[PDB]
Paper text:
Far upstream element (FUSE) binding protein 1 ([name] or FBP1) is a multifunctional single-stranded DNA- (ssDNA) and RNA-binding protein, which acts as a master regulator of diverse cellular processes including transcription, mRNA stability and translation as well as RNA splicing. Central to its single-stranded nucleic acid (ssNA) interacting function of human [name] is a tandem of four K homology (KH) motifs, namely KH1, KH2, KH3 and KH4, which is embedded in the middle region in between the self-regulatory and transactivation domains at the N- and C- termini, respectively. Comparison of the four structures showed that they all adopted an evolutionarily conserved eukaryotic KH-domain architecture, consisting of a three-stranded β-sheet packed on one side by three helices. A common property in recognition of up to four nucleotides is facilitated by a ‘minimal KH motif’ that constructs an ssNA hydrophobic binding cleft formed on one side by two short consecutive helices (α1 and α2) and the GXXG-motif-containing connecting loop and on the other side by the domain’s β-sheet and the variable loop that links the β2 and β3.
In contrast to the upper part of the binding pocket, considerable variations of the amino acid compositions within α1 and the β2-β3 connecting loop led to the remarkably distinct properties of the nucleotide binding pocket at the lower half, which is responsible for interacting with ssDNA nucleobases. For instance, a longer loop together with the presence of small hydrophobic (A194 and A197) or polar residues (T385 and T388) in α1 of KH2 and 4, respectively, resulted in relatively open binding surface with strong positively-charged electrostatic potentials. In contrast, the migration patterns of KH2 and KH4 were rather ambiguous with some slight shifts observed for nearly all nucleotides, except fragment 4 and 10 that had a high GC-rich content. Interestingly, the potential interactions of KH2 and 4 with ssDNA 5–8, which shared the presence of a triple-repeated deoxythymidine (TTT), was consistent with the previous suggestion on the preference of [name] for T-enriched sequence. In addition, we observed interestingly also that KH2 preferred the T-rich fragment 7 over the TGTG-core fragment 8, which was in contrast to KH4 that showed no preference for both ssDNA. As expected, in contrast to the wild type, all mutants did not show a shift in migration on native gels upon incubation with the selected ssDNA. These overall results suggested therefore that all four KH motifs of [name] interacted with c-Myc FUSE ssDNA independently and individually, and KH1 and 3 might exert potential preference for ‘TTTGTGTT’ sequence while KH2 and KH4 might have broader binding specificity.
Residue numbers in the entry: 375 to 454
Write the structure that this text describes.
C-alpha cells in the first residue's frame, strides 16, 4: 500500500539532500526502498525561497527515508 509525505526545506539545503553528483538522493532511495521527488513546476503562489519534496512508498519506507534526510540536513523537515 503506497502513500505520500510532502515536506519543504529552504532552497539552499537542497544540495545536502541531492549530494554532489546526485549520489545522496540515489543512496537514500536505494537504502529506504522509497522514491524521493523534487517538485518540477511549482505553482505561481509557491515560495521561491522553499523547495517541496514528496517521499512515495509504504509508510515503513517513507519513515526510514525521512530519518536519513533529517541526518543530512541536521534537523527535522517542515511537513505540509
Amino acid at each position: 500500500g503506497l502513500q505520500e509525505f510532502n515536506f519543504i526545506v529552504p532552497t539552499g539545503k537542497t544540495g545536502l539532500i541531492i549530494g554532489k553528483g546526485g549520489e545522496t538522493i540515489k543512496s537514500i532511495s536505494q537504502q529506504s526502498g522509497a522514491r524521493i521527488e523534487l517538485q518540477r513546476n511549482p505553482p505561481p503562489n509557491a515560495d521561491p525561497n522553499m523547495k517541496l519534496f514528496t517521499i512515495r512508498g509504504t509508510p515503513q519506507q517513507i519513515d526510514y527515508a525521512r530519518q536519513l534526510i533529517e541526518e543530512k540536513i541536521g534537523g527535522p523537515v517542515n511537513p505540509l
